[PDB]
Design a protein around this ligand. Structure first.
Ligand SMILES: CC(C)CCC[C@@H](C)[C@H]1CC[C@H]2[C@@H]3CC=C4C[C@@H](OC(=O)CCC(=O)O)CC[C@]4(C)[C@H]3CC[C@]12C
Ligand SMILES: C[C@]12N[C@H](Cc3ccccc31)c1ccccc12
Ligand SMILES: CC(=O)N[C@@H]1[C@@H](O)[C@H](O)[C@@H](CO)O[C@H]1O
Ligand SMILES: CC(=O)N[C@@H]1[C@@H](O)[C@H](O)[C@@H](CO)O[C@H]1O
Ligand SMILES: CC(=O)N[C@@H]1[C@@H](O)[C@H](O)[C@@H](CO)O[C@H]1O
Ligand SMILES: N[C@@H](CCC(=O)O)C(=O)O
Ligand SMILES: N[C@@H](CCC(=O)O)C(=O)O
Ligand SMILES: N[C@@H](CCC(=O)O)C(=O)O
Lengths: 412, 416, 409, 424
């Protein structure tokens, strides 16, 4: 027969762009060297503020999966974009005794759609009304952000770990005390000799003449050149390809828990990520900051995180990591949490659910999803860097360590 | 509602521990679970069934679910070992017992494939698992002395001595020995307390040595920053580079990939690459620990295995020599799932229970308590390690004790 | 011992055309005489008198050698009509046009072997590889970070307060805090302080190790930027296929009626229509367009661009793609079609390849002072503009410090 | 219209792959790195696994097979491909006849009638051109010498590689401008003491005998000490900057390297026997010395010399550029060292009296202009080149350090001569 297909515009999975002036989809070839497959989508063109329906050209990962599923079972389809432009939610707006769904969920429950072929996440709140197949996308939750600077701390203890610096001091007193012993006021001359040799103070106060003490001091001066060459070495190594900052909160981080108006982390309104922080009473406080600073479309939050408007952005790992591989101004949070999966959605009484889901279980077994990945998740590299001017904050840090040592020295 | 469940033993998903003989019953987390042995026995040629206590991750899922949906359970283990393989149209193992109706539900280390999904049903995925390969890398990397070459010693000391011998005489209240300590001190980044020469010609040669100082310093700064700026990388080819599943040979003399015979990974590799079916069936392993020893003792280049079980192992490895090829690559993308009766069953409500364990965050707390490994628990562990400082301090301290040997030899020559 | 008249063009370094030496009244060095029939006008003629010049180069030398191994006479002639080869209204003009026109029995020079040309004329074995290529000049002094001067002055003030905090020994004036601010400030600028301090000097020394380590480490940071990477690498990139994209547009062009024009026309119609409007005049003029920002990138023949980059002063313009060459065609002596010394000329070229004399020929002509650098791209061999900025800081602060000396006076 | 013509080829690895047949007899279906079907034909060649040298069918695929098919399309002819009996390329020799010579290899079988056209990476040269006719080359290449990837040596250069001769004159001009300016600025307007003051402040000598105390000379000496930490920081900065992006010294600095001309028995090089390079070094009398060494160390198969270069058995292997560069893009233990030489071209071979030479050469020119040969280059030169390889300089190399040490020692010795100059 003929069944309707509802989908939403998601950047990596479902591209929704209009056609040329003639009316057919522009034929193109991907960077791999393959014809990109597109179909017709009748939905609200966001270009016209009017919210009017207009057929278009749609293509992507979920489009290839929709053509594949249409090839597996002996059925045809008629794709159309979702009317309201959101994923879906359950609510009761005008009826205090009867509730309904909105989005693709609403069109499915109202009969306006027969199948959802978009990155639709599986969860328990939606499982009460629809039936899902075996997931076609393994993902999670990561806080996505656009991150800025080389130094957050004094640069003397950064290249050498605490064991290396403490070892250097232990050698300072091993050569000061071993020099006082081998050369046998005097203690201040030994400490001033070792410290003046390590710091190039050049006081010229005293010196021992014993071959044991001269060899000890030569090992101490050469070792001083090697430890300052290691501090300047690894200190110069953290100039290119520096380790990422802790702005990536992760599952259990302080930045994700505390709702400060300066570090704007938020979720898309009328979506699941708002329900993740709205249901938990502990995050209710954060929910407050999310209640007044939430965004509608995920692309608006992406542009806000690119325009330095939104600090962090908790979102699915597939989309956030994809935008991090496409727009290298943004990075996802480490320690991936809330691992879920995108899968197709069907109604309960449908028999297709038995076969189609099994087909997905077969679709993973043959490795077709790996080719779809090779097509629709490709990482575009960026500038590997560099920091340049960005050296002031550190220099103020190390200068703050020196000035702090001058204050503690004034107390002494 | 006594519901008997059949399961298999594979840590840490299902840890089996004998009952405490002092307490008799099972203590703490563990739920009662029997196990019956055909080959040997005490009475009735096998009729006696041993009693055990089962605790772990999936066991906590079965007991917690048993508390949520209010269905009681008398756990039972599988006698014939398998995962989800079917032979000659007859299935054996956990999914085999799920098809044989000997267990209403089956929770454990059971993978979800199409062959089982066609004959039995599964729930929502609990953990992402698939086909993956594991190989071990030797911790062979090796340190600040590495910067300067061996020409540093002979050339530098020789030139110094010759120059103070030649230069001192180009230099030509008190006169204190030789100023070679001033030259070597100047080589080690100024910091020289020695008195410079008062002559006019010596103001030239010393300057030259200053050159030979700073340049050497620069080398000691460049080259120590050269060998240390090459770390934290891996260049093994991705995207099925070895081709061993189809063509066993590669740029390496051999690629060995083993699968558990009559297993889900072997059947999936048997149905994917027939060359991998022949070479995997010829290189079929016995147990998992035997293949792990084959990967640690150099007896096997790689292994092909479940992905999650190998993912928890990274923490397990000590000194973490071992690692998962691809920094977390997954090939099949399937999931674990509790088996249910075909067509008919509580499947919907039980699935609500699973996704409820995911909704309450119990997967994150369980992964933090069970899954999390001291290893890699920290974010990635740029900073100079203790090995380089050990390299320098071995020579500094070696020259310190050797300086004391120069003091004892100075005493042996002083007593003359 | 045959006529075998040869037509040629002038294209350095392959065919350099020099005036006859007036003192020698003959072609100097190892040059071969080459005339030019100036037809349209003359002092007392109308298309009959030919001027005299002296042609010498790489192609001239290969012609001389081939003529030595294969016994034939020849008189070198320049091409009056067009240049090179081009086909208009089914009529052949240029060198290939004169070779097929029987106005020249042979045509040796910077002439490419192409199918359309090989239809009407014969070609020998190729002696030098020559195709299409791209070349672009990349259109795109310490990291003080507004802290060198402010931290040096505040380090002098902290040197004064620390000098008053020392309170040791005996000092000359009631100056000395400024002598410990010049000694402590100098020590902050990597030791070099001759003043024996009476610790504050130890704190300033820690600021010398840490702060100096930051100055040298970041000085190595700004210099660790990998460069010479081409703006457009593939020549199948989007910058070439779709010009009206990045603003401003990437202006590029080529030289008409060559191999690149006919092959680019028969290959890409749209790219040809886009590049025909921005076509350039001469090779050196196109180098100026690639240098003066009038053209972001420039694409043309490979060999002439290889030498033109090898002899380019400063080696600024380099080939895009680290020497990538498309098309793959090669030059060759154009002989008469259908019949000719088809095999004897090739045999001469291949025996000349057997002795290996090209290597010496390319060493004499092709090898530039740019391919003679180290095997590494070397980044910037030596600071000529960056070091001059630090010298402008030392000289500017030297005249300003002299203003503090006259104001101090 | 058929004109079934036999076709002979050789096993050169990028251009002609030769792998065995599958249990059913068909070729193993493989997928092009680009994600496309790999071509396939059958070859009647020598079985290298058996003593008999028997003829056994195989599956052969790659560049020359694909180009062979494209030509079989553009021209209406049919083919039957097989590997050459003797297993080597064409060369002329006289084994049993002292007065008459003959060709053996592909060239031989092509002249012997056993084949009607040879399509392989056949070198083009004078000796073969007198008996067989070549096309306009489908491959433009040369000869490179292959070596194993030995200890990363340093790019040899003098100690002044960081700063050209033009900038040092300005730097020294500022040094004497601030030492003579320090002589004028001292005491508010001795000379040797001023040069010792400014130089002692620039080199951190710290003698302290002479030192200006004026706030103009002490502040100018603080901009001088800051110019010393910044100039030294720039010296160590760029001196460490050449360290990365360095080209490890190529073992043989071209065919005319010090170790290359002199046949020292420490560095052994050779090429494939009965091959084009054997005619190149056998004809050229001057290279006879090298040839002498090669005369005793050449190999029958080229792969054997490749693995010899990988197994530290053979030191250097002069060969065709496309094969060696491809093996360098396949094995990371092999590099091609030095400047290219004998730049020739692989072209299709056929008897001189063949009219197929005209249309075939023309279709090679077209396949060049059509951009088809570039596609073949992307397919069979996968260019899975080993990249991101990082230079590791030896903590130091006597050379590049004996230059600075030689300048300093020279300064001393001359400086004794300069003490003799001050004596007068
Ligand atoms: C899908 C089936 C129905 C084929 C469509 C038949 C027509 C609708 C044909 C007639 C002329 C074709 C077109 C000819 C010109 C271009 C080539 C190509 O566009 C470009 O090359 C981009 C440069 C530019 O926009 O000018 C692809 C679309 C288009 C409009 C073709 C699209 C389809 C067109 C309009
Ligand atoms: C002498 C030295 N003092 C600072 C920092 C540093 C670090 C390691 C070794 C040597 C130096 C400096 C800058 C530039 C050149 C040499 C040095
Ligand atoms: C885990 C394991 O090795 N299981 C094997 C199974 O693969 C094999 O088919 C069977 C035949 O006896 O023997 C079992 O022990
Ligand atoms: C530099 C230039 O434009 N030269 C053209 C030439 O390419 C063309 O062949 C000829 C007429 O055909 O007209 C000339 O002006
Ligand atoms: C597109 C193309 O180059 N086609 C060529 C044609 O140019 C040539 O003249 C002819 C031989 O006569 O062979 C065709 O294959
Ligand atoms: N000599 C060439 C001119 C273009 C080029 O040098 O590549 C030709 O015959 O067209
Ligand atoms: N004409 C140059 C070409 C160099 C190259 O192959 O890039 C030569 O033969 O030396
Ligand atoms: N190594 C590949 C080369 C062909 C290709 O993948 O393009 C093979 O032997 O099949």
């Amino acid at each position: 027969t003929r069944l309707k297909i509802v989908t939403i515009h998601q950047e990596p999975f479902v591209y929704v762009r209009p056609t040329t002036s003639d009316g057919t989809c522009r034929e193109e070839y991907t960077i791999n060297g393959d014809p990109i497959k597109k179909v017709i989508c009748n939905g609200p063109d966001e270009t016209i503020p009017g919210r009017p329906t207009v057929p278009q050209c749609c293509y992507g990962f979920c489009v290839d999966l929709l053509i594949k599923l249409a090839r597996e079972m002996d059925f045809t389809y008629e794709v159309h974009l979702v009317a309201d432009g959101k994923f879906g939610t359950q609510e009761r707006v005008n009826n205090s005794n009867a509730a309904a769904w909105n989005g693709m969920m609403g069109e499915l429950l109202s009969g306006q759609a027969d199948m959802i072929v978009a990155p639709l996440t599986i969860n328990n709140e939606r499982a009460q009304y629809i039936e899902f197949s075996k997931p076609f996308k393994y993902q999670g939750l990561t806080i996505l952000v656009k991150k800025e600077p080389r130094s957050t701390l004094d640069s003397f203890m950064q290249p050498f770990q605490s064991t290396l610096w403490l070892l250097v001091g232990l050698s300072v007193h091993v050569v000061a005390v071993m020099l006082y012993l081998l050369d046998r006021l005097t203690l201040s001359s030994a400490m001033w000799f070792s410290w003046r040799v390590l710091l190039n103070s050049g006081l010229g106060e005293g010196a021992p003449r014993s071959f044991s003490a001269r060899i000890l001091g030569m090992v101490w001066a050469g070792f001083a050149m090697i430890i300052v060459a290691s501090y300047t070495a690894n200190l110069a190594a953290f100039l290119v390809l520096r380790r990422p900052e802790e702005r990536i909160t992760g599952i259990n981080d302080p930045r994700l828990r505390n709702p400060s108006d300066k570090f704007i982390y938020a979720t898309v309104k009328q979506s699941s990520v708002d329900i993740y922080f709205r249901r938990q009473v502990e995050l209710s406080t954060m929910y407050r900051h999310m209640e007044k600073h939430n965004y509608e479309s995920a692309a608006e939050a992406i542009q806000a995180v690119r325009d330095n408007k939104l600090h962090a952005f908790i979102w699915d790992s597939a989309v956030l990591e994809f935008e991090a591989s496409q727009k290298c101004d943004l990075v996802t949070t480490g320690e991936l949490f809330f691992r879920s999966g995108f899968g197709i959605g069907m109604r309960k009484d449908s028999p297709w659910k038995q076969e189609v889901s099994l087909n997905i279980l077969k679709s993973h077994e043959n490795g077709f999803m790996e080719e779809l990945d090779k097509t629709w998740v490709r990482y575009q590299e960026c500038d590997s860097r560099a920091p340049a001017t960005l050296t002031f904050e550190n220099m103020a840090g190390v200068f703050m360590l020196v000035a702090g040592g001058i204050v503690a020295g004034i107390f002494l | 509602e006594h519901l008997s469940i059949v399961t298999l033993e594979e840590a840490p998903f299902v840890i089996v521990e004998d009952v405490d003989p002092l307490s008799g019953t099972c203590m703490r987390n563990t739920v009662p679970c029997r196990k019956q042995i055909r080959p040997e026995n005490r009475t009735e040629e096998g009729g006696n069934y041993i009693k055990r206590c089962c605790k772990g991750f999936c066991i906590d899922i079965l007991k917690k679910i048993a508390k949520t949906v209010k269905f009681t359970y008398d756990l039972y283990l599988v006698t014939n070992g398998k995962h989800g393989k079917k032979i000659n149209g007859v299935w054996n193992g956990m999914i085999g017992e799920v098809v044989t109706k000997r267990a209403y539900m089956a929770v454990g280390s059971l993978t979800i494939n199409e062959e089982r999904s066609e004959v039995v049903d599964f729930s929502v995925p609990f953990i992402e698992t698939g086909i993956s390969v594991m190989v071990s890398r030797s911790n062979g990397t090796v340190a600040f002395l590495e910067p300067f070459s061996a020409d540093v010693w002979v050339m530098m000391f020789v030139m110094l001595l010759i120059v103070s011998a030649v230069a001192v005489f180009v230099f030509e209240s008190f006169t204190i020995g030789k100023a070679i300590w001033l030259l070597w001190g100047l080589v080690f980044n100024n910091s020289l307390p020695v008195q410079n020469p008062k002559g006019t010609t010596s103001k030239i040669m010393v300057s030259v040595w200053a050159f030979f100082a700073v340049i050497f310093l620069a080398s000691y700064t460049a080259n120590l920053a050269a060998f240390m700026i090459q770390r934290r990388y891996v260049d093994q080819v991705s995207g099925l580079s070895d081709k061993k599943f189809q063509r066993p040979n590669d740029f390496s003399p051999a690629f060995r990939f083993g699968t558990v015979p009559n297993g889900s990974t072997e059947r999936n590799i048997r149905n994917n690459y027939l060359e991998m079916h022949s070479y995997m069936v010829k290189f079929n392993q016995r147990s998992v620990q035997d293949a792990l020893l084959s990967l640690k003792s150099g007896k096997l280049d790689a292994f092909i295995y479940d992905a999650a079980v190998l993912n928890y192992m990274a923490g397990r490895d000590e000194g973490c020599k071992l690692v998962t090829i691809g920094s977390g690559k997954v090939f099949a993308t399937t999931g674990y799932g509790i088996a249910i009766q075909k067509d008919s069953g509580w499947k919907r409500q039980v699935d609500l229970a699973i996704l409820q364990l995911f909704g309450d965050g119990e997967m994150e707390e369980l992964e933090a308590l069970w899954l999390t490994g001291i290893c890699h628990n920290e974010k990635n562990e740029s900073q100079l390690d203790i090995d380089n400082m050990a390299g320098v301090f071995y020579m500094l301290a070696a020259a310190m004790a050797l300086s004391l040997i120069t003091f004892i030899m100075e005493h042996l020559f002083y007593k003359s």
